[PDB]
Design a protein around this ligand. Structure first.
Ligand code: CLA
Ligand code: CLA
Ligand code: CLA
Ligand code: CLA
Ligand code: CLA
Ligand code: CLA
Ligand code: CLA
Ligand code: CLA
Ligand code: CLA
Ligand code: PQN
Ligand code: SF4
Ligand code: SF4
Lengths: 123, 257, 86, 70, 185, 645
């Protein structure tokens, strides 16, 4: 069944989750350390600030009623509605990648333990 | 001495240690033949005359050259004792299992310990020093002595006749039934205690469940007080065709093997 | 009492017997291995659960398995030295 | 070697007669094949690779400071 | 007594979501502008130059420390001139990295390709060494000629790897490797 | 041959399939210096010691080389108030902000105490240090490969070794240093303090210089020899001369005919000697850390506050580490000896000693931290008069405030050293005592329960370093003497961290108080430490959070390196948490999945990937924990004391 298929290829699931977590942690930590070094060395301009252009695109096209970033769309709503959606910037990219790293690592540990409850080569 | 040791007897301090262990830990019991594996295994019997309780021995000649230590058993706080009776060829030094050092007597030797693990460690040390006939006994609260370790006279490292296998499971470790397969049975949480027949039966049952093309619907019970529902399906014809399917499937499966 | 089991894969090493600090494992005759001997555990009540027997078993996986049962602890299984329950 | 001396010793046996005019070279009897084998060890080889990579990065950063050509 | 800055949503009841094609480019985005005319970026550069000059003034003219700080100042000036072509917001002035996929100043496609080629080179060199040195001895004891042969021969990794993938010499059949089947699948 | 045997460990690792795992590599590293018992054990130990001496000589030569070439030592000589920097930093990446790094090792003050005035002298010392390191390496080679077995030095020739160390090494070194002081370190400091130029040091050994210019042997010389930077060197010279005399006289007036190592094997004898030597070196390091700020001995040392703080903290850490290693090697020697009957009284009073120490630790912990928590609660509840302070229930350390005695021609140190103590000093001293007692409890427990215990009765068969005995008996993890040293290292970290926190806050409080101005003479309490180091909140606010401003606002300044090391230390410390909280099995299963991923792509490494063993994981976690905590304190202290002093 569904669970049997998940168990049979549990090695693939655990390995790919491990790769995702390794990539996310490596890059988030490395970019944060690079920004730390640049700010420490009095060169804040040379930080790696990857603009969260995908979330900005979603926000501008689907949520925002005024041109805040201008990417994807620039139309202004004639009768906008109000809410408390924050306006994102460069740091939010790294923070969301940290969030993704945390979620993926938690899922990795939980899935790995659940699927190895059926047994590992050590047990 | 009253400050050195409590003034009351070990039995007085024990209170109702028995009749409470039977209540607090009803699972904690020995099998009918504790030191042995089969009922017809000689079962050599010893008494307090042979191995007396330590509180009845003062400056016994069989005691080794031991100076006493704080690491020994709890007199007046525990009543169970384990004794070692080994015969030496010469007077040499050995490590006590409770740390410190004692010197063996030329002939008979006798030590008392609380845990059997200490006695077995001392036996390992002595056998490493070329000593046979290391006999380990257990002293109970009332003084009943149980002979242990070379229970049938032959050390467990050497195979001996009359020893029935115990806790032997006739398959591989991972051939035990899974907990889900043994659900709602007495072996649900302990699949390693199930019988070989039970494990094989449930491992075949899970396979039987996964063949719904031939699995039987098992009609609903008649619980309502009203008349039987006419329905539109004949359970008798279904049962007959299921008998035919079972017969043909068994024939084909046995032809395969 | 931590249940200890012996399986067909046992090859009569006697290493599990020598590794037991409480004389639980015991060598019985059998006709399943070339050694014509198989470990048995007739004194499980003395098993502390140290799993030294599992450390000394050379088979691909443990021909002797110690299943810890924390809901059935015993003064012999807990290795009590200063408290007596008998 | 009745006198207890460590393995791989360049020491003559201390049980000698009257003063001997002998040549006892105190230098390790190393081998060119052995030295090349030792420098090919995984720790040595990979630490040398790491040092080479780090120095290459150092020189690239020195002669091309920052990411000016991004 | 006030709340957080309230943002205005699009009451998009028209039943269609319009994505402007002309806004799919960095040059058309109203929140990022080139660093050359970014006033905040220019102020950052001026502050950096002023701090470097202040640090230089501590050491007397002609000293080695003076020359070192002067070289630092020249490096900062050249870096600023290079970064004038980058894209840096409108209120921060810090140059940004555009990870959309557009090939722009400070983009990601070229660095991604360079890194992927380099690390595929590394991985293929290691894999080739392990395939041609199926021995733990040659793993602990690196066969330096063969190791460097594999390292310099892995330059063709992107095509050799795909050829092996499509020809079955790259991946291993699941029935031939140690896969976890302890549940007796 | 020898080159072939250099990688002999790796050849043996690859020879057997059982050693073709990463665990074998980690064992090869862990068992690197664990010189096994053999006929050449003493040769190996002595050669390793000589090699380490050569390494330290390399370090000293490098430090003198940096002083000669990459330091403003001459400018510091012309003006001691300037920042001592002895590490140039090249313009790579963007690190140019921290180009002059203020060195706090005190080498400038040391060299000034040695009469060094020219960088040429530092170059010569660096060259001679390299020469000495080369000689030490040659000697270590020789002893390992061609020399005596050295097996008689701890049992048979212990009298000769001890007598040589007493007379020759110690006494003659002290006498030679006294001669150096009197002849070139006093006159050079005289001519520098007076500003009358310094000749070549050898010209002071002319019998026509101030040695015979005036024969007056008291504090009277040309013009006015009233330099108080110079008197500590005079006292040091007198101390060294007296110490040399007393050592030489007492060595020949001592029995020394008692070697307690007759009953121990050579390996266990070496381990016990190492343990007692580590104890002595650690307590000496702690004593020097106290005496560095207790008594001024180096020129312009107390003025350089970062140097004082660094010396104190570094030597406290080294003393704590060596004190822990003392018990570590005592445990190793006890557990690895065949018949260690010498410790019979303590192995038979095992439970008595351990339980009394347990009660002492419990009493001290509850009392000290309850004083702290009670002060926290009373201050939170707005009850300052119910706290433990000077304006409240006063825990005055009366035993501290008395050293009066018959004079008999003495002075200075006949008192409490001119410092008054208060409730905060009492409470923090009891915290120090409790933490020291707990570290000693763990270490002594590891020593005593090393061969046997009530839980496991054959722990001597398990050697010194084992992960556990199994999950039986309820669980027997961390019973090994190694694991007791592992926990004692954490408790030493806690103890020394609190000690250095107490010292640093007291030092900053005294610096602020002496910065009254001149007119301000009622310090009331003020004394930020004395007024606030009575609560855990007081510490957390007025010491950690208060002084962290320097280390967290260091970006763009030369202390940005301290800020970055602060962050990296936090990172390493949380990684330690990762290693310490987790277990080997999980990581093994994760590595199994990753290795399946590898095998799927025909990668298949043969050195089978195994996760770190239980003891290896604990050791890695402890190493990262110590590194992170000590680095955080290092960055914090250095940034705070350099920015503000
Ligand atoms: C700061 C503390 C810390 C850190 C860094 C990690 C890091 C990690 N944990 Mg972890 N963990 C921690 C605390 C921490 N843990 C604690 C306290 C617990 C509770 C016990 C756990 C419990 C836990 C579990 C149960 C699991 C992890 C896993 C992981 C890994 C996830 C993959 C990843 O992000 O790779 C990124 C790796 C890092 C960020 C480590 C630092 C690497 C460098 C220094 C940073 C990058 C620098 C630069 C880019 C490299 C330069 C390259 C070249 C120039 C030389 C990773 C190694 C999972 C795992 O192993 O899956 C793979 C997993 O299953 N951890
Ligand atoms: C031949 C070398 C080699 C190759 C081809 C691979 C290939 C792979 N590894 Mg891997 N790995 C290696 C060495 C190698 N690894 C080493 C030495 C370690 C120990 C640190 C690991 C630890 C490791 C983990 C923990 C994980 C992978 C994963 C992966 C897969 C995804 C790629 C990835 O995340 O890489 C990232 C690689 C690393 C994080 C470690 C790289 C360390 C160095 C750079 C690699 C060594 C190269 C080698 C020494 C070259 C020598 C050549 C010379 C002898 C000629 C991929 C199949 C992931 C996976 O299963 O995803 C499906 C995963 O979770 N690997
Ligand atoms: C005690 C050990 C020790 C330590 C920690 C250092 C540390 C340092 N030395 Mg150094 N040095 C030492 C001993 C030491 N040295 C000795 C014994 C000598 C005499 C031969 C020198 C001679 C020396 C010179 C001549 C220079 C340094 C430099 C440096 C710095 C950069 C090193 C570098 O560029 O790496 C390079 C490493 C390699 C190329 C690998 C080989 C660094 C702070 C440099 C410096 O401060 O630049 C401003 C520099 O120019 N050192
Ligand atoms: C994964 C995280 C990450 C990433 C993506 C980067 C990326 C970068 N860092 Mg960085 N850094 C990191 C982590 C990271 N770092 C960490 C953890 C730290 C703390 C130690 C730093 C500290 C740091 C400093 C201090 C500096 C950088 C700099 C740089 C930039 C110049 C790199 C360069 O020229 O290399 C040189 C090497 C090459 C170009 C490789 C050669 C080209 C290959 C071989 C070609 C192969 C064929 C195709 C680059 C954008 C520099 C900068 O300011 O640039 C903006 C700089 O000065 N980094
Ligand atoms: C500081 C520690 C130290 C110690 C304790 C020793 C101890 C020893 N060394 Mg030695 N050695 C050392 C450092 C040390 N060495 C160093 C650093 C080097 C490198 C230069 C050497 C080079 C060396 C050689 C080349 C030889 C020894 C020898 C000896 C042994 C004979 C000593 C003797 O009876 O002469 C007693 C000596 C005196 C009473 C006065 C000696 C005055 C010296 C020359 C002053 C310098 C003795 C075991 C010899 C040996 O093995 O003999 C069997 C031998 O041939 N050593
Ligand atoms: C006056 C002669 C003299 C002098 C100056 C030294 C000086 C020294 N010896 Mg030594 N030694 C001497 C005679 C001398 N030895 C003799 C006669 C013997 C033979 C019994 C030894 C046997 C000896 C050993 C076995 C060791 C030292 C060691 C040491 C060093 C550290 C001592 C220490 O911390 O305590 C210890 C120190 C350089 C130690 C060292 O670091 O070795 C290089 C060490 O392990 N010595
Ligand atoms: C990790 C090891 C380590 C490191 C890196 C340092 C580093 C440093 N130490 Mg140090 N130290 C250590 C361990 C260490 N120490 C230990 C374990 C001790 C205890 C013995 C000391 C004791 C010590 C003293 C006493 C002094 C230093 C000093 C110094 C600094 C100058 C170094 C120098 O060339 O002076 C070389 C050192 C000296 C010239 C002092 C020699 C004093 C002698 C050797 C003391 C002998 C005591 C011994 C027990 C006598 C036996 C008495 C018995 C007969 C009754 C430097 C920062 C000096 C300093 O702060 O200067 C700024 C300084 O005065 N250290
Ligand atoms: C005079 C000092 C001294 C000496 C000679 C020894 C000697 C020995 N110790 Mg020992 N020890 C000491 C002090 C000393 N110790 C102290 C002070 C402690 C308490 C911290 C200990 C704690 C200790 C334990 C717990 C154990 C030993 C063991 C051993 C033996 C094997 C050591 C080995 O293989 O390590 C090989 C060398 C290493 C592992 C070094 C690796 C680096 C370490 C782990 C961390 C260093 C981090 C570094 C400082 C920071 C990096 C810089 C940063 C900027 C990145 C050997 C007899 C072991 C044994 O079995 O003894 C028989 C053992 O289990 N020791
Ligand atoms: C362990 C450390 C410690 C100590 C010494 C104190 C001390 C005190 N607290 Mg306190 N407190 C603490 C921790 C501590 N606190 C902690 C951790 C908290 C947080 C929960 C509080 C919260 C707290 C509150 C909320 C209050 C106090 C108050 C008080 C005071 C009165 C307490 C009282 O009635 O005494 C009771 C004392 C005893 C019953 C006697 C016990 C001690 C005896 C003498 C031991 C004798 C042993 C004997 C010598 C053994 C040998 C015998 C043999 C020779 C025969 C007193 C100054 C009160 C206050 O405001 O007063 C200022 C108050 O209202 N405390
Ligand atoms: C993570 C972890 C492992 C896995 C650790 C392994 C497999 C060690 C291998 C890690 C490699 C060697 C890291 C190499 C160094 C890093 C790349 C970082 C240093 C270099 C950077 C700073 C650039 C254990 O084996 C373990 C065992 C017992 C308790 C806890 C743990 C535990 O927490
Ligand atoms: S060690 Fe394992 S295989 Fe050998 S006799 Fe014991 S149970 Fe059987
Ligand atoms: S948890 Fe680890 S250390 Fe503790 S008993 Fe189990 S295996 Fe041993």
């Amino acid at each position: 069944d569904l669970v049997g298929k998940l168990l049979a290829t549990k090695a693939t699931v655990i390995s790919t989750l491990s790769w995702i977590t390794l990539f996310l942690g490596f890059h988030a930590t490395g970019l944060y350390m690079h920004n730390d070094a640049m700010a420490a060395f009095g060169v804040p301009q040379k930080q790696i600030i990857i603009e969260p252009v995908f979330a900005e695109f979603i926000q501008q096209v689907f949520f925002l009623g005024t041109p805040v970033y201008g990417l994807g769309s620039a139309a202004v709503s004639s009768t906008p509605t109000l809410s408390f959606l924050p306006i994102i910037s460069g740091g939010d990219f790294l923070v969301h990648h940290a969030i993704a790293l945390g979620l993926h690592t938690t899922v990795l540990v939980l899935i790995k333990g659940a699927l190895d409850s059926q047994g590992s080569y050590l047990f | 001495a009253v400050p050195n040791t409590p003034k009351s007897s070990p039995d007085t301090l024990a209170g109702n240690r028995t009749e409470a262990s039977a209540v607090s830990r009803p699972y904690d019991k020995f099998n009918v033949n504790y030191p042995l594996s089969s009922p017809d295994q000689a079962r050599t019997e010893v008494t307090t005359k042979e191995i007396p309780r330590p509180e009845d021995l003062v400056d016994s000649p069989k005691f080794p050259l031991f100076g006493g230590s704080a690491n020994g058993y709890m007199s007046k706080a525990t009543r169970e004792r384990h004794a070692i009776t080994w015969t030496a060829k010469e007077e040499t030094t050995f490590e006590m299992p409770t740390s410190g050092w004692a010197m063996m007597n030329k002939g008979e030797n006798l030590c008392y310990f609380r845990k059997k693990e200490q006695c077995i460690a001392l036996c390992k040390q002595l056998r490493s020093m070329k000593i046979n006939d290391v006999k380990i006994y257990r002293l109970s609260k009332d003084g009943t002595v149980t002979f242990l370790h070379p229970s049938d006279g032959v050390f467990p490292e050497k195979v001996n006749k009359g020893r029935v296998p115990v806790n032997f499971r006739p398959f591989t470790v991972c051939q035990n039934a899974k907990q889900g397969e043994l659900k709602f049975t007495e072996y649900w949480t302990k699949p390693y205690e199930a019988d070989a027949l039970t494990t094989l039966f449930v491992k075949a049952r899970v396979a039987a469940y996964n063949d719904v093309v031939n699995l039987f619907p098992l009609p609903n019970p008649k619980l309502t007080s009203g008349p039987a529902e006419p329905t539109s399906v004949d359970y008798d014809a279904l049962t007959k065709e299921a008998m035919e399917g079972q017969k043909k499937r068994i024939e084909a499966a046995m032809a395969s093997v | 009492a931590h249940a200890v089991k012996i399986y067909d894969t046992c090859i009569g090493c006697t290493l599990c017997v020598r590794a037991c600090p409480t004389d639980v494992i015991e060598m019985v005759p059998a006709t399943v291995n070339a050694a014509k001997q198989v470990a048995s555990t007739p004194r499980v009540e003395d098993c502390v659960g140290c799993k030294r027997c599992e450390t000394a078993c050379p088979t691909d996986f443990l021909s002797i398995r110690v299943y810890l049962q924390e809901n059935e602890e015993t003064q012999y299984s807990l290795g009590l030295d200063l408290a007596d329950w008998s | 070697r009745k006198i207890p001396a460590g393995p791989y010793s360049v020491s003559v046996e201390p049980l000698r007669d009257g003063a001997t005019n002998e040549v006892s070279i105190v230098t390790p009897p190393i081998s060119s094949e052995g030295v090349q084998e030792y420098l090919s060890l995984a720790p040595v080889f990979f630490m040398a690779l790491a040092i080479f990579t780090s120095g290459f990065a150092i020189e690239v950063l020195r002669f091309f400071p920052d990411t000016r050509y991004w | 007594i006030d709340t957080a800055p309230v943002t205005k949503m699009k009451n998009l009841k028209t039943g269609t979501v319009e994505v402007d094609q002309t806004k799919l480019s960095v040059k058309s985005w109203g929140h990022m502008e080139p660093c050359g005319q970014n006033k905040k970026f220019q102020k950052r550069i001026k502050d950096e130059a002023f701090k470097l000059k202040k640090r230089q003034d501590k050491y007397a003219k002609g000293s080695a420390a003076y020359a070192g700080v002067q070289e630092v100042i020249d490096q900062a000036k050249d870096t600023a001139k290079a970064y004038e072509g980058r894209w840096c917001g409108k209120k921060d002035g810090l140059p940004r990295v555009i990870a959309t996929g557009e090939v722009t100043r400070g983009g990601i496609v070229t660095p991604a390709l360079m890194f992927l080629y380099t690390t595929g080179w590394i991985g293929y060199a290691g894999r080739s060494y392990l395939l041609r040195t199926k021995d733990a001895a040659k793993e602990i004891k690196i066969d330096v000629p063969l190791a460097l042969t594999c390292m310099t021969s892995a330059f063709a990794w992107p095509v050799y790897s795909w050829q092996d993938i499509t020809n079955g010499r790259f991946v291993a059949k699941d029935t031939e490797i140690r896969v976890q089947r302890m549940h007796m699948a | 041959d020898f080159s072939k045997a250099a990688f002999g460990s790796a050849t043996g690792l690859v020879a057997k399939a059982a050693s073709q795992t990463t665990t074998a590599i980690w064992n090869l590293h862990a068992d690197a210096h664990d010189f096994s018992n053999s006929s050449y054990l003493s040769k190996q130990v002595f050669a390793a010691n000589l090699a380490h001496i050569g390494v330290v000589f390399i370090w000293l030569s490098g430090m003198h080389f940096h002083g000669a070439y990459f330091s403003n030592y001459l400018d510091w000589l012309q003006d001691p108030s300037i920042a001592p920097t002895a590490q140039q930093v090249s313009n790579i990446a963007n690190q140019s902000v921290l180009n002059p790094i203020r060195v706090t090792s005190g080498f400038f003050n040391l060299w000034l105490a040695e009469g060094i005035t020219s960088t040429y002298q530092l170059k010569v010392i660096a060259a001679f240090g390299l020469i000495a390191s080369a000689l030490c390496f040659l000697g270590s080679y020789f002893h390992m490969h061609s020399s005596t077995s050295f097996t008689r030095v701890l049992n048979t020739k212990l009298t000769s070794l001890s007598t040589h160390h007493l007379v020759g090494l110690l006494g003659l070194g002290s006498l030679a240093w006294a001669g150096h002081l009197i002849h070139i370190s006093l006159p050079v400091n005289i001519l520098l303090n007076a500003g009358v130029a310094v000749p070549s040091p050898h010209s002071l050994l002319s019998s026509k210089a101030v040695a015979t210019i005036v024969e007056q042997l008291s504090f009277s010389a040309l013009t006015s020899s009233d330099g108080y930077v110079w008197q500590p060197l005079v006292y040091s010279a007198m101390h060294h001369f007296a110490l040399a005399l007393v050592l030489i006289v007492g060595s020949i007036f001592l029995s020394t005919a008692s070697n307690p190592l007759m009953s121990f094997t050579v390996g266990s004898s070496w381990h016990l000697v190492l343990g007692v030597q580590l104890f002595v070196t650690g307590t000496a390091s702690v004593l020097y850390a106290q005496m560095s700020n207790a008594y001024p001995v180096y020129p312009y040392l107390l003025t350089d506050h970062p140097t004082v703080v660094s010396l104190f903290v570094h030597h406290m850490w080294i003393g704590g580490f060596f004190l822990v290693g003392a018990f570590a090697h005592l445990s190793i020697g006890l557990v690895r000896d065949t018949l260690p009957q010498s410790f019979s009284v303590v192995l038979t009073q095992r439970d008595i000693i351990l339980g009394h120490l347990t009660w002492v630790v419990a009493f001290l912990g509850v009392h000290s931290f309850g004083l702290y928590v009670h002060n926290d609660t009373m201050q939170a509840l707005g009850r300052p008069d119910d706290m433990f302070s000077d304006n409240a229930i006063s825990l005055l350390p009366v035993f501290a405030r008395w050293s009066t005695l018959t004079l008999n021609s003495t002075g200075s140190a006949v008192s409490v050293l001119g410092v008054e103590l208060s409730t905060a000093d009492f409470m923090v001293t009891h915290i120090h005592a409790f933490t020291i007692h707990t570290t000693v409890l763990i270490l002594v427990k590891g020593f005593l329960y090393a061969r046997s215990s009530r839980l496991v009765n054959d722990k001597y068969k398990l050697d010194f370093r084992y992960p556990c005995d199994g999950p039986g008996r309820g669980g027997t993890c961390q019973i090994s003497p190694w694991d007791h040293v592992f926990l004692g290292l954490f408790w030493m970290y806690n103890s020394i961290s609190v000690v250095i926190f107490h010292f640093f806050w007291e030092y900053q409080s005294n610096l602020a108080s002496i910065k009254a101005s001149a007119g301000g003479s009622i310090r009331a309490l003020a004394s930020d430490f004395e007024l606030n180091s009575i609560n855990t909140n007081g510490w957390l606010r007025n010491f950690l959070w208060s002084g962290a401003a320097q280390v967290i606002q260091s970006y763009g300044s030369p202390l940005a390196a301290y800020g970055l090391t602060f962050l990296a230390s936090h990172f390493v410390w949380a990684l330690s948490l990762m290693f310490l909280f987790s277990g080997r099995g999980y990581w093994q299963e994760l590595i199994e999945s990753v290795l399946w991923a590898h095998h799927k792509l025909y990668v298949v490494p043969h050195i089978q990937p195994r996760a770190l063993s239980i003891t290896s994981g604990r050791a890695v976690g402890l190493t990262h924990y110590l590194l992170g905590g000590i680095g955080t304190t290092w960055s914090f202290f250095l940034a705070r004391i350099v920015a503000t002093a």
